[PDB]
């Protein structure tokens, strides 16, 4: 697209300085207050009224103090460290605009001062690889394509473009000796037309100065009406490019973010940077502009709560607290007074536990050299104890279909089983109807028929002549006919699954013309007759592979070669949520020590409902194995007093603190703390936020079981 | 002292147009349904039934009033014993 | 749909005022044959006096035990709470019907595995031989939601019928008469 | 004590699985898989 | 209920009249999506494919998949008959040149390295998998010298061999490496690291054969507020303003289908959305094009309670809960017999009673202390 | 009484989605990728089925017993004596 | 008592028509478009 003319003449130079915007004084933390639905994003499914719902997306944490961003206004400007800060747009970010905009501003660059306060638009620099500047080497270049997301207009216009920033070489700017930090100016000094209608293109005049832009794929920009309430401005990225979202889209008197744009920036964003905005406002008409907060979005489930007029206008962030717990498993933001059993809604990082015996490598030797077997003398290869490539195999073949039935072609590479049973021969593509679960013809009756009791994979492919090691055979041969010639006739002898045919002693001589019968008689006096069918081999030999699987409880012992380290459990993986393959047997679990117990010799200990109970590692220790999800929580609520407690019923409050990387986030934080609430032991389990008061009571709203009652505070 | 105590005597009578309920008047899902035997004329019934219960049992529970003597009491005190909170009021303004 | 009661709210005002009116009696004949047209304070009295409340006391406090009778009634008011039990079951049965009607709507708007819960989108995304597959799962799932609402709306109206039943045991016991049993009409000596 | 005598036996006559109110999900840790008392020790597994 | 001989009482029927129905179309205008860059210049490789969105335009399937020689159309929880009747809230395509003969490595779970390295498909949304040979009349896609299809993507470790592999829908990681071309087979790329370690990215090149072939993976999107992406129909804009009122249609509005009965209504409901949902997401309201808010009711929404008396074989209509004059004008739900009297003003017309509309009574002064067929609120039903 | 034992019995006619409601008609006319499939959707509606007519079958015998119950006490209190309560008996004042 | 607690404990081990009863072992064998469907099974079958 035409991005327009190119800019020319020098940069306005700025002085870089951090100590000055980043002072304790200028710190005004406002964190996300989840109460009034802040930046929550409106999902787009539809538009729910009047009813509470649990929500799983891109949400900001409850009570986040974010990143708080100030800028200043000019001569020369006057910024800090920002252009050269990379941050990581993990999952995209929210934006809170103009949160102060009629209170007193204090300048960063002015003194003595209160102004009224005004908001400000943030403008970003998105790219997907990061780089140095040269002539300086500081952090901060963006290479390649980059999203550049810049307000205009004096305010009233934002600019959304994607482009490579070439730097210029001319000082002050971009690529040269002389550059600091890529600011932009907005100048309302006559250079906006401020005191007119706003109307300009300082901005990306400046940015032009900055950078040259080339080979510019889009140039989108958006109306912004002047107004001075608080917005909220939020960008992610998903399949369909990449979503900005604005409060003042739908109702800019609202909290709700509204999609607005989608940008086609497909490939993956990893980074951004705050592109620092030092306005050139002279000492006349010098104004204290306001600052906005960037709060990192993460993947969490939500409880929105949805008004009469369609409005998120509460949320309940639901890994936060228990009684966030609380609301989010009854999704009720209104929950009367009592005791509750709730989820777990806190997703924590998990380990990786390994644990692969030692085996050798299975060979496909005798599938690769000589002459593949004709089909009804198929070879089968059975595998037990050892390591199989199925790369190798496959590269050496063009597979023309890879039908697979209870299991996947990709899961049959990175999977462990109990054997691991091949059956090849030589079988022409042409022919794959006759192959196919329940196909009629002589394949199946005579030749080979499938056997669909285990996970079994049909795979037909291409000899490649470069391999040299599989001599093609003289033609393709099958029988038309296996029966048994009685007083009647015809009495005709049918494949089992998976088994070979009853002539196939018969067809041992081989046929040589199309059409050649073979007959044997047999001590009844009946004749058993062979009939086989002979075509000739095309450009390249192609052979069918049915591979079949079993899965062990036990031991897995045909595993996929893999270079995985064996992980050790024995103090790091503890006690926390692990994804665990231990000998082929995979899944999510906690693991405790334990005194060994369970059946001998058996690897894996199992319950009555076959539930992996119990492991018993390599270093010789026994191991107790948890859902993840165990300890049980109950949260008891008092409405009158709005205060909440936590009991882990049935748990010790020891393993209640080494076990603390299961619940909310507030609960990890008092289990890490040694708070002089901490965890105490009663009759029903550990209580958190409990005294024991010696108190006696004939009747409470709050029974915590075996005669205990939850005195509200 | 006064003992509250609630004893409820119906439910709510509900009819589930099964047809309607289940296909809602596609052709195609009507063809498939039709499969599955006489279900949509048996929940009728059963429902039907039910109600027809609830019905019986309310009209026993009310045939009471007919053959029960009382007497008529004062409005307001009857002797010394203020039985206002209990009766119907008598206002001449409307309806009864 | 929703069925009408088979009564009117008149009818049922009627009954209630039939058993205000039934209060009074002999309460001490041998049967139910004959009605006596004693007045509502002498059967009270008459109640009291077979409670074990000797004749000399009641004619003494006569005016002191109509002043309690007349604070327990009024202080009936303050039992409509969300504190007493009996109000608690009165809102738990209103809110049982409509659960049940809540649950019946809810379980048209679930795919229950399909690509939609509606059968037009399904004729329209899809084509014969996968939306006959389609349609015969929201079948197969709509007539087991159905089944068990017919269940439950049986179960429900058998309690009903037995609750309705304890019912006129009650007011035929305790409204109609005095009772002798313990905790059979609260708790303490019954009167009225 | 908070039982009569008739009611020990009645009590001992009677097999329950004693549930672990009190530490129980370190109880099962510790006794291992049982079959008598696998349904109380599948609380912490199944989710109830 | 399925029984000849039906004891009396008041039951519940359903509705087994078929009526008939008109069709409402209301669709918005929009300009046409250009699958212009899918047909000019020379296919993508399919590590580096190229992605198309439309949204808010209207699109002729015909016209794109004319211009090819269809060899596979495999599609999911969408037909690809329906993928050109259908209306959309976008309509995703990723369309690379790929040979034909390698459509076993582009299914879905397949092994190799064409879904772990240069493309994954993506199946949270309906997608549909198209194979086309471009044929030779069309030369405005010019054939490539090879296909080009990465076969590693790792970051060379101390232990080494980090396979790196793609997510459904997204790009390799290999991407910006891969980007100079791979002029021979099995031509290796590596880049240092900051941390020190090499990604290391392998090409296969193989030569294109006498046709070129393409792959497109179309995706698309239903939403519930509008579908813009819509084909191009000259189907015209019906009125439901006179005509197609009070009775059963099969509405087609801005992307949303089914079938309802349309009523007068006072707008009620959110003040920006065109369709109008309940707590249990049932079209409940839609504001159309003329300024109207119109009433969505199914197409059978009235209750229909039939009493019948046995001994005089006589039965009558009660429609519960709806006023006698919305019964007359919306007669085009019930019975043949039903339709027929509601047509002809009967002198035993419709009787507004306090359950609803009844058809067949008349207002009595009768009282009674018992009856067999209650109508409900102390109402009785008197068999003739 | 009957509609249990008819329930049942009708339960085993309709095919539940499958091609047939015979296992033999699936073993024919399918093969065993497919025949897996099919015998699979026929338990699951069965044993959802038998499960549901067991569970009636134990609530009607719990009623039962309760009523049971409920005639002895009827026995002991109408038929072998007299009742001096009411309605307990029948209406009225009750004799034998 | 124990009795519920046994079949609510067992319904968890049945694979209800899938290909396993654990939700692991079917992400591990299969690919989003089975995934999703044997997911689907058991989440059903769950629900009742
Ligand atoms: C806002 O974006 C529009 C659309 O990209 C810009 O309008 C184009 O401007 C270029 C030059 O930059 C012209 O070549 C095009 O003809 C314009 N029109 C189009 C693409 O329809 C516009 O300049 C941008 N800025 C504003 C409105 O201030
Ligand atoms: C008898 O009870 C009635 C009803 O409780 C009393 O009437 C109330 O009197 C108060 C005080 O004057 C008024 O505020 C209320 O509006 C009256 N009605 C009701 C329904 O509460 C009455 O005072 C009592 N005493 C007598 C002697 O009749
Ligand atoms: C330090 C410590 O106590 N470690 C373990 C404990 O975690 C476990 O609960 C117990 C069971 O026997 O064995 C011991
Ligand atoms: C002639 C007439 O009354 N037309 C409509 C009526 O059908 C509708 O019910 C009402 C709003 O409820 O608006 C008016
Ligand atoms: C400013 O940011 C840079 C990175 O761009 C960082 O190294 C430096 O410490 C920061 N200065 C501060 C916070 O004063
Ligand atoms: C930047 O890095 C280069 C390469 O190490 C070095 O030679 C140069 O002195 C550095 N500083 C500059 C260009 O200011
Ligand atoms: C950028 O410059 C810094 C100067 O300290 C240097 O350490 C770093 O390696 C450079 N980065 C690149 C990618 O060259
Ligand atoms: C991207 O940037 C890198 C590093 O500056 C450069 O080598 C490359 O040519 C650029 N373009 C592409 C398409 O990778
Ligand atoms: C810009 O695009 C042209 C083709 O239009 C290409 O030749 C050139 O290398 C590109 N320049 C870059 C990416 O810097
Ligand atoms: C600031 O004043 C403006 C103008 O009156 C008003 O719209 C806005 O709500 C006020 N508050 C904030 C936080 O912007
Ligand atoms: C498997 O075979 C491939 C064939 O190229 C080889 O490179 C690799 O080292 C083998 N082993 C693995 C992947 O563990
Ligand atoms: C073993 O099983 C038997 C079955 O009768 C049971 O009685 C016994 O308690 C079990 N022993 C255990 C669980 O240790
Ligand atoms: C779509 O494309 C075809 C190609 O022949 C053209 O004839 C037709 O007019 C186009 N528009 C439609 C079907 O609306």
């Known amino acids: 697209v035409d991005m327009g003319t190119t800019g020319s003449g020098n940069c306005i130079e700025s002085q870089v300085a951090p100590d000055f915007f980043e002072t304790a004084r200028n710190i005004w933390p406002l964190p996300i207050d989840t109460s009034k639905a802040e930046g929550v994003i409106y999902p787009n499914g539809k538009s729910y009224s009047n009813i509470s719902l649990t929500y799983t997306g891109l949400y900001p944490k409850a009570n986040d103090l974010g990143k708080q961003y100030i800028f200043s206004d000019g001569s020369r400007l006057f910024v800090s460290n920002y252009s050269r800060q990379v941050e990581t747009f993990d999952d995209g970010f929210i934006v809170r605009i103009g949160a102060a905009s009629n209170k007193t501003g204090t300048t960063v660059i002015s003194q003595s001062t209160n102004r009224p306060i005004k908001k400000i638009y943030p403008a970003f620099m998105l790219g997907h690889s990061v780089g140095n500047y040269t002539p300086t080497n500081i952090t901060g270049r963006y290479l390649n394509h980059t999203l550049v997301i810049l307000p205009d207009g004096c305010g009233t216009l934002v600019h959304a473009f994607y482009c490579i920033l070439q730097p210029r070489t001319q000082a002050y700017c971009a690529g040269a000796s002389t550059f600091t930090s890529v600011t932009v100016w907005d100048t309302p000094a006559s250079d906006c037309a401020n005191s007119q209608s706003y109307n300009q293109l300082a901005n990306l005049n400046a940015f032009k100065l900055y950078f040259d832009l080339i080979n510019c794929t889009f140039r989108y920009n958006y109306t912004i009406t002047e107004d001075e309430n608080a917005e909220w401005f939020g960008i992610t990225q998903d399949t369909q490019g990449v979503h900005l979202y604005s409060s003042r889209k739908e109702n800019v008197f609202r909290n709700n973010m509204f999609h607005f744009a989608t940008l086609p920036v497909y490939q993956k964003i990893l980074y951004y940077t705050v592109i620092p905005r030092s306005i050139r406002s002279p000492f006349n008409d010098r104004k204290a502009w306001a600052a906005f907060y960037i709060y990192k979005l993460h993947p969490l489930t939500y409880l929105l709560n949805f008004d009469v007029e369609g409005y998120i206008t509460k949320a309940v962030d639901c890994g936060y607290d228990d009684f966030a717990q609380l609301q989010c498993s009854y999704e009720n933001f209104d929950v009367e007074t009592g005791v509750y059993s709730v989820s777990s809604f806190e997703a924590s990082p998990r380990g990786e536990f390994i644990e692969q015996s030692v085996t050798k490598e299975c060979d496909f030797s005798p599938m690769l050299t000589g002459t593949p077997p004709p089909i009804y003398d198929f070879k089968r290869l059975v595998f037990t104890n050892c390591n199989y490539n199925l790369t190798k195999l496959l590269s050496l073949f063009q597979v023309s279909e890879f039908s697979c039935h209870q299991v996947s072609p990709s899961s049959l590479a990175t999977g462990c089983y109990s054997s691991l049973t091949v059956d090849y021969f030589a079988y022409s593509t042409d022919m794959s109807s006759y192959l196919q679960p329940g196909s009629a ?22 000899v490649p002549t470069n391999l040299t090691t599989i001599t093609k055979p003289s033609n393709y041969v099958h029988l038309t006919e296996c029966y048994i010639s009685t007083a009647y006739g015809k009495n005709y002898l049918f494949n089992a699954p998976g088994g070979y045919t009853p002539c196939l002693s018969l067809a041992s001589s081989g046929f040589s013309r199309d059409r050649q019968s073979h007959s044997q008689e047999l001590p009844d006096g009946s004749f058993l007759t062979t009939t086989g069918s002979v075509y000739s081999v095309g450009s390249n030999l192609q052979m069918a592979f049915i591979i079949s ?29 692990v994804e665990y393959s231990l000998h082929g047997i995979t899944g999510r679990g906690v693991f405790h020590n334990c005194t060994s117990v369970g059946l001998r010799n058996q690897r894996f200990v199992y319950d009555t409902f076959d539930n992996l109970v119990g492991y018993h590692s390599h270093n010789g220790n026994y191991y107790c194995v948890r859902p993840c999800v165990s300890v049980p929580v109950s949260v008891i609520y008092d409405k009158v007093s709005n205060s909440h407690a936590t009991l882990f019923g049935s748990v010790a409050c020891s393993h209640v603190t080494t076990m603390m990387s299961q619940f909310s986030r507030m609960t990890k934080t008092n289990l890490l703390a040694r708070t002089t609430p901490g965890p105490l032991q009663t009759t029903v389990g550990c209580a958190m936020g409990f005294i024991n008061s010696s108190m006696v009571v004939d009747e409470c709203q709050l029974p915590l079981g075996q005669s205990l009652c939850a005195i509200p505070p | 002292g006064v003992t509250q105590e609630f004893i409820e005597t119906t439910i709510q009578k509900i009819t589930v147009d099964c047809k309607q309920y289940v296909c809602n008047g596609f052709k195609k899902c009507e063809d498939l349904l039709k499969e599955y035997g006489q279900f949509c004329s048996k929940i009728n019934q059963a429902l039907h039934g039910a109600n027809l219960r609830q019905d019986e049992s309310i009209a026993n529970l009310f045939s009471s009033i007919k053959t029960q003597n009382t007497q008529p009491l004062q409005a307001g005190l009857n002797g010394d014993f203020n039985l206002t909170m209990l009766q119907i009021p008598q206002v001449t303004t409307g309806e009864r | 749909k929703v069925l009408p009661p088979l009564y009117d709210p008149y009818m049922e005002a009627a009954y209630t005022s039939s058993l205000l009116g039934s209060i009074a009696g002999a309460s001490w004949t041998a049967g139910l044959s004959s009605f006596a047209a004693i007045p509502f304070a002498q059967s009270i009295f008459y109640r009291l006096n077979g409670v074990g409340i000797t004749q000399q006391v009641l004619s003494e406090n006569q005016k002191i035990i109509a002043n309690k009778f007349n604070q327990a009634l009024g202080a009936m008011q303050t039992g409509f709470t969300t504190t007493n039990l009996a109000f608690n079951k009165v809102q738990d049965a209103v809110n049982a019907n409509a659960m049940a009607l809540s649950k019946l709507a809810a379980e048209l708007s679930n795919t229950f595995g399909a690509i939609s819960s509606s059968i037009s989108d399904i004729l329209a995304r899809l084509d014969p031989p996968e939306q006959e597959a389609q349609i015969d799962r929201l079948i197969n799932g709509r007539l087991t939601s159905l089944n068990a609402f017919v269940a439950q709306q049986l179960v429900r109206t058998e309690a009903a019928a037995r609750s309705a039943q304890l019912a006129q045991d009650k007011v035929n016991e305790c409204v109609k008469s005095q009772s002798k049993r313990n905790g059979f009409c609260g708790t303490g000596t019954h009167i009225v | 004590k908070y039982r009569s005598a008739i009611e020990d036996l009645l009590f001992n006559k009677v097999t329950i699985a004693d549930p672990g109110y009190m530490q129980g999900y370190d109880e099962c840790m510790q006794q291992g898989p049982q079959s008598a008392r696998d349904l109380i020790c599948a609380q912490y597994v199944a989710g109830y």
Request: proline share 4%.
């Open chain 1, 549 to 577: 699987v079993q899965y062990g409880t036990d031991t897995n012992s045909v595993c996929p070669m893999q270079a995985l380290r064996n992980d050790t459990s024995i103090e790091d993986k503890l006690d926390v949520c």
């Open chain 1, 441 to 462: 013809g002589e394949i199946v009756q005579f030749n080979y028929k499938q056997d669909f009791s285990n996970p079994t994979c049909r795979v037909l492919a291409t």
